[PDB]
Amino acid sequence: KVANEPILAFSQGSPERDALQKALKDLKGQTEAIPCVVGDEEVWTSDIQYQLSPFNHAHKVAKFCYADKALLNRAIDAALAARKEWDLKPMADRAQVFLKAADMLSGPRRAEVLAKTMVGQGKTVIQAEIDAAAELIDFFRFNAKFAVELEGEQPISVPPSTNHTVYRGLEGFVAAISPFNFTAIGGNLAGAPALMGNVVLWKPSDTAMLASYAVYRILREAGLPPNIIQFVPADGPTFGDTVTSSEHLCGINFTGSVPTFKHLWRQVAQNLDRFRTFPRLAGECGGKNFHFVHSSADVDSVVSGTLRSAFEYGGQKCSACSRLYVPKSLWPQIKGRLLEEHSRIKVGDPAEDFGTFFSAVIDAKAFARIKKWLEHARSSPSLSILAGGQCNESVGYYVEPCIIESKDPQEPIMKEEIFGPVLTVYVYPDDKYRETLKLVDSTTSYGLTGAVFAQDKAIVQEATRMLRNAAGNFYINDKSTGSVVGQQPFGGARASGTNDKPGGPHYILRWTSPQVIKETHKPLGDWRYSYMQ
Amino acid sequence: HMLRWKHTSSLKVANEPILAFSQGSPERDALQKALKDLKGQTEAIPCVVGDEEVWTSDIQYQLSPFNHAHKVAKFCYADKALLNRAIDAALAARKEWDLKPMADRAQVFLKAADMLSGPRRAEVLAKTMVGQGKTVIQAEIDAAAELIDFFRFNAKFAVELEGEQPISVPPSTNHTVYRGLEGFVAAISPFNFTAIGGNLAGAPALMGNVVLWKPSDTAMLASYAVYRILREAGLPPNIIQFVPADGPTFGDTVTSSEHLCGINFTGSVPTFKHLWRQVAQNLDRFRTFPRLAGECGGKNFHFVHSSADVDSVVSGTLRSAFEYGGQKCSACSRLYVPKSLWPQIKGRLLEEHSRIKVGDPAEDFGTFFSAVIDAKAFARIKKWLEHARSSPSLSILAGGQCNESVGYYVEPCIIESKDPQEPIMKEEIFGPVLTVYVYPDDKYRETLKLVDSTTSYGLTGAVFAQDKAIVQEATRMLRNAAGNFYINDKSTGSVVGQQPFGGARASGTNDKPGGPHYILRWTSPQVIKETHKPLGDWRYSYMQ
């Protein structure tokens, strides 16, 4: 029996707000030296790297290093040697490690992981809370529940035989490759397979190293044995090349770009004759998510839900709204309100100013990519910047929220994932709402999240049918971000990935390869059959 | 609430009872009639796209394995044009089929299951016997029982899956929609089980997919029979396209389509790997990432401990190794026996061997097993028998002869190897060829390690022992050597809902058809959240 972790309010004078402020002060001016961890060994290579605070890049929040091919190969060997015993452990015993970790994250370690996510990844208080605390805690508690309950899914036994399913971990090691934008995803990508009796090489994101290592240490402290999860930061291509070259690879649990996932998929395919078994690839690959508005919509909900979806955490979510479809009849209201609220958004230091709505984007490369899109918006004949458009990387990687109108529903900016605070609006004629729904479905290569805002039941039913494959997480009168474990299992198809729905009950099935054992309790008869006589 | 979700139902099903076919029984008379109905007959089996029967110039024949002069079916290979037309038409039918309630789709399969159970039982058994060379009881466990069980149990699993729903908290309602995959699925089925073709095409269809089904050439007669029953049970046009084809041609075409969303495959490891590689080559062309499911071969073991019941070892091993001529991915091909029990076991095996009758399964119900499937299989097995004769490490204990003048007939053959790593202990033969290795009792632990490490496969295996500690030890040691592991029973004959079937290592992706989770591979869920109250401000209270 598990329920969702409460989201704290962080009111003035509250225990959690005081605790968080202390944790933030604990990180001010600090650099943690974070080693690779193989078993219990802390290992340093000469390939030194730094994680910078996105809103103050002079602050090196961590120094770490890239594992080389040799170190990665040692990590593989060490993990494989620990796998059999771990896999033989009762599911309940493995679950206990994650349940203990969840309690630590909920209580004594909450402030630490929130603060490290804020300072290291640039999240505001609430974005860190829903991620590093609530989502991570929920992943650990719900997956533990799902896994313990899965053992109860057993086949039919008929006398004189007894049948039993053993939920084996996969034979080999799993490579877990996590993204910068959610601390919780790292914990799940490495943790879910480990829960199911796998051993894991975890390559955490360079730009989330501080919080990722915090989670790692908590798992170890909660009782995770050595060599079950190896903590191995590495150059992306080097890590991919190394794990896909190992005969013992049995899975890749990936969250990141489509091209990188496709590359790994192709590397595994090139090497099929080397592997002991067919590796399982799981990929969560982003989107180009929509909010579609019908003329019956509640304007205030459209405005607030769209501002949040598009701009929270600087739009750096695979689920963020980046294309808004508005009927002509409502445009003067929605335009006016978006622009007015836009001027009230505070972009700044989220540790020093809790008034901040969102902060700097993650790193120099993200800043550069997003700037290219703002430059495009200034160039394109079909695009007009209505608000925002500024950026400044002198102190932090700061990009202002930007609202653009496109006259072309199929402009590249309507199609390509930017991962920045950049919202494009297309205004459609009221009487062409159906043709426009078709455009929502056909315009992009993605299928992740989408929302419809409408107060007309027939419209909602029609839109729901038409957009069936345009979004794997579909929202009626709510924003396209903020899936909650156990409530909105998350994922989509088309180019958005393999859709294994982490956050729901079936995800863990990807990380078990069941064995069925039949025991017969009476001696066998003759080999002949009666009809043969 | 603007979206209304209907309550979900449940379904009660049980395994299809195996019939006895005793003398004078209605089922025995019915089967004999159905067999006579096929004597001297050749069915012309077209490709079917929608409701159109299509012929191409690439005419092919299916032969009766025990009487290859008998062409049981004339069929044709779909060309690339027809395959692509089949894809287009399937795609145009998909949205409607996907939107149909799960319960309505399930009803087609429940109707088909009942037809197979009753009025069509004799037909599908007879066609499996005559076309694939099965004996009465092998046809019965396959074309009737397993296929019927697949249809009924998958229907239950699918209807009940819709009841697995997420938590809702005010002010919102959450619902999971179990969407079929967007695109088409290619189903590629093997000669050796009629039921497998039905499941490979049928399970994805049940889940709201559309399918191009390429049946096995050497099982065409029974396969088309199943296809027709599905259509008669109410399967709409263009949901399953019946498209026999050249294997490479079929794979090239389906892997070249932007709309491929899955391959459901049972067959050889190299072919599965090839398809996997073709999909990887075409990744940038697809609308979504295709899901590949592969059930491949085995090199399966029976391991005997000194505490084993000798008669159970002999009975279960003869059946596992030799039923259907050992042409099962699950068949025992390696037997490990302790020195202490070898005199008893060898004596019994050799005696019982001499009592095994090989012959025409239609004309003589006394037949234990019949001819192997085709000329290619016969040639391969012949080469292995020749290897047994020439290899210094091998000794033929019984059988060893073969004759293809009338049917593809091979004697059951028992070989002893002095080398536990001989090639014959490693490579899948798919013929009635059992190899025995005798180990010293005091080396049982080391030998268990060999059982685990000797082959590339991980499909089925059995341990015969009455010592509980030994059973526990072996169970732990062999955990990954068999996806279907048996204690004091034979390594073949998994039953739907009782022993979900499949294994890893080189044996495939292990999606466990026969169990409750298999259908999850053929759905891509969507979660809908409906919020029933206006949203608040975009700011949060803590920002004040």
Token pair 């309100």: residue: A337
**Burial (CB count within 10 angstroms: exposed 0-12, middle 13-18, buried 19+), residue A193:** buried
| A151 within 8 A of A515, measured Cβ to Cβ | no
Here the tokens at position A242 are: 């190394």
CA distance B411 to B399: 5
CA distance B184 to B138: 32
Nearest to B483 by CA among B284, B374, B330, B366: B330
Residues 174-233 of B with CB under 8 A from A: 174, 176-177, 179, 181-182
Token pair 């799993």: residue: A174
Closest CA of chain A from B290, distance in Å: 8
> Is the preceding peptide bond at B171 cis, omega within 30 degrees of 0?
yes
CA distance A474 to A480: 7
| B142 within 8 A of B124, measured Cβ to Cβ | no
- Measured CA to CA in angstroms, residue A327 lies from A331, A464, B33, B103, B283 at distances of 6, 18, 70, 38, 37
| A532 within 8 A of B319, measured Cβ to Cβ | no
Name the strand (E) or helix (H) holding A212.
helix A209-221
Here the tokens at position B340 are: 């202490």
| A78 within 8 A of A67, measured Cβ to Cβ | no
| B21 within 8 A of B27, measured Cβ to Cβ | yes
Q: Which amino acid is at B478?
A: L
Nearest to B203 by CA among B268, B128, B262: B262
Resolution (angstroms) equals 1.7
Do both B24 and B73 map to the same domain?
Answer: yes
Interface contact A476-B3, CB threshold 8 A: yes
Distance of alpha carbon B16 from its chain centroid, rounded? 17
Name the strand (E) or helix (H) holding B139.
helix B136-139
| A150 within 8 A of A167, measured Cβ to Cβ | yes
For residue A268, give every residue at least 6 positions away whose Cβ sits within 8 Å of its Cβ, in sequence order, or none. A244, A249, A252, A275, A279, A281, B280
B485: which strand partners?
A517, B461
Any CB–CB contact under 8 A between A301 and chain B? yes
Residue A203 annotated as binding? yes
Residues 74-113 of A with CB under 8 A from B: 87-88
Do both A269 and A221 map to the same domain?
Answer: yes
- Measured CA to CA in angstroms, residue B490 lies from A346, B316, B428, B452, B508 at distances of 71, 5, 18, 18, 21
Interface contact B527-A489, CB threshold 8 A: yes
For residue A307, give every residue at least 6 positions away whose Cβ sits within 8 Å of its Cβ, in sequence order, or none. A338, A341, A342, A345, B538
3-state class (DSSP) for residue A360:
coil
Any CB–CB contact under 8 A between A308 and chain B? yes
Known catalytic residue: A318?
A: yes
Interface contact A497-B289, CB threshold 8 A: yes
Among A285, A318, A391, A402, the one annotated catalytic: A318
Interface test with B, best of A141, A268, A291, A532 (most B CBs within 10 A): A532
CA distance B435 to A350: 71
| A321 within 8 A of A423, measured Cβ to Cβ | yes
| A126 within 8 A of A10, measured Cβ to Cβ | yes
Of A484, A500, A516, which marks where a domain is finished?
Answer: A484
Nearest to B264 by CA among B211, B228, B195, B329: B211
CA distance B66 to B69: 9
| A521 within 8 A of A161, measured Cβ to Cβ | yes
Burial readout A3-16 (b: 16 or more C-beta within 10 A, e: otherwise): ebbeebebeeeeeb
Do both B199 and B344 map to the same domain?
Answer: no
CA distance B327 to B77: 25
CA distance A204 to B254: 37
Strands (E), A363-418: 383-387, 391-392, 398-399, 402-406
Identify the sign of the CA torsion B334, A81, A249, A186. positive
DSSP string, A132-179: IIIIHHHHHHHHHHHHHHHTT------TTEEEEEE-PBPSSEEEEE--
CA distance B70 to B38: 10
Any CB–CB contact under 8 A between B508 and chain A? yes
| A424 within 8 A of A323, measured Cβ to Cβ | yes
Experimental method used, please? Answer: X-ray
Q: What are phi and psi of A442, to 5 degrees?
A: -95, -15
Burial readout A472-497 (b: 16 or more C-beta within 10 A, e: otherwise): bbbbbbbbbbbbbbbbbbbbbbbbbb
A52: which strand partners?
A60
Do both B472 and B512 map to the same domain?
Answer: no
CA distance A160 to A410: 65
Here the tokens at position A246 are: 């190992």
- Report DSSP state, residue B289: P
Nearest to A242 by CA among A267, A266, A260: A267
Q: Are strands B433-439 and B484-487 parallel, antiparallel or unpaired?
A: unpaired
CA distance A475 to B462: 51
For residue A172, give every residue at least 6 positions away whose Cβ sits within 8 Å of its Cβ, in sequence order, or none. A80, A248, A249, A250, A251, A275, A276, A277, A279
The backbone region for B428, taken as left when phi is positive above 0, alpha when psi lies in -120 to 50, beta otherwise, is beta
Here the tokens at position A357 are: 């709505």
DSSP string, B11-22: ----PPPPP---
- The vertex-A135 CA angle with A131 and A139, nearest 5°, equals 145
Q: Are strands A473-476 and B523-531 parallel, antiparallel or unpaired?
A: parallel
Distance of alpha carbon B26 from its chain centroid, rounded? 29
- Measured CA to CA in angstroms, residue B387 lies from A15, A59, A315, A496, B396 at distances of 79, 72, 67, 52, 10
- Report DSSP state, residue B60: E
Q: Which amino acid is at B251?
A: G
Do both B286 and B330 map to the same domain?
Answer: no
CA distance A479 to A306: 6
| B183 within 8 A of B288, measured Cβ to Cβ | yes
Do both B532 and B452 map to the same domain?
Answer: no
Q: Which amino acid is at B420?
A: P
Number of structural domains in chain A? 2
CA distance A450 to B170: 20
**Burial (CB count within 10 angstroms: exposed 0-12, middle 13-18, buried 19+), residue A341:** buried
CA distance A28 to B16: 70
Do both B171 and B63 map to the same domain?
Answer: yes
Say which of B483, B501, B505 has its CB closest to residue A276. Answer: B505
CA distance A261 to A285: 8
- Measured CA to CA in angstroms, residue B260 lies from B84, B87, B243 at distances of 11, 9, 16
Any CB–CB contact under 8 A between A529 and chain B? yes
Do both A493 and A459 map to the same domain?
Answer: no
3-state class (DSSP) for residue A382:
coil
Do both A154 and A77 map to the same domain?
Answer: yes
CA distance A60 to A210: 10
Residue B428 annotated as binding? yes
Q: Which amino acid is at A15?
A: P
| A370 within 8 A of A393, measured Cβ to Cβ | no
Name the strand (E) or helix (H) holding B74.
strand B67-76
Tell me the chain B residues in contact with residue A118 when contact means C-beta distances shorter than 8 Å. none
3-state class (DSSP) for residue B267:
coil
CA distance A259 to B283: 10
Do both B282 and B306 map to the same domain?
Answer: no
Do both A278 and A303 map to the same domain?
Answer: no
3-state class (DSSP) for residue B396:
strand
Give the structural domain span for A319: 286-484
Q: Which amino acid is at B285?
A: R
Any CB–CB contact under 8 A between A528 and chain B? yes
**Burial (CB count within 10 angstroms: exposed 0-12, middle 13-18, buried 19+), residue B376:** exposed
A50: which strand partners?
A63
DSSP string, B445-499: HHHHHHHHHSSSEESEEEEE-S-HHHHHHHHHHTTTT-SEEEESS-S----TTTS
For residue A298, give every residue at least 6 positions away whose Cβ sits within 8 Å of its Cβ, in sequence order, or none. A453, A455, A477, B534, B535
Among B47, B76, B296, B329, the one annotated catalytic: B329
Q: Work out the angle between the directed axes of helices B102-117 and B220-232 (0-180°, nearest 10).
A: 130
| A199 within 8 A of A228, measured Cβ to Cβ | yes
- CATH number of the domain bearing residue A111: 3.40.605.10
Do both B485 and B538 map to the same domain?
Answer: no
Nearest to B432 by CA among B353, B502, B347: B353
3-state class (DSSP) for residue A433:
helix
Identify the sign of the CA torsion A79, A85, A91, A93. negative
Nearest to B95 by CA among B202, B239, B204, B255: B239
B295: which strand partners?
B266, B508
CA distance B458 to B451: 11
The backbone region for A307, taken as left when phi is positive above 0, alpha when psi lies in -120 to 50, beta otherwise, is alpha
Known catalytic residue: B53?
A: no
Token pair 């002198």: residue: A394
CA distance A505 to A92: 16
Please compute, for residue A35, the number of CA atoms within 13 A of its CA located in the half-sphere on the CB side: 10
A363: which strand partners?
none
CA distance A503 to B246: 43
- CATH number of the domain bearing residue A435: 3.40.309.10
A383: which strand partners?
A406
Nearest to B306 by CA among B438, B476, B486: B438
DSSP string, B357-370: -BS-TTT-TT-SB-
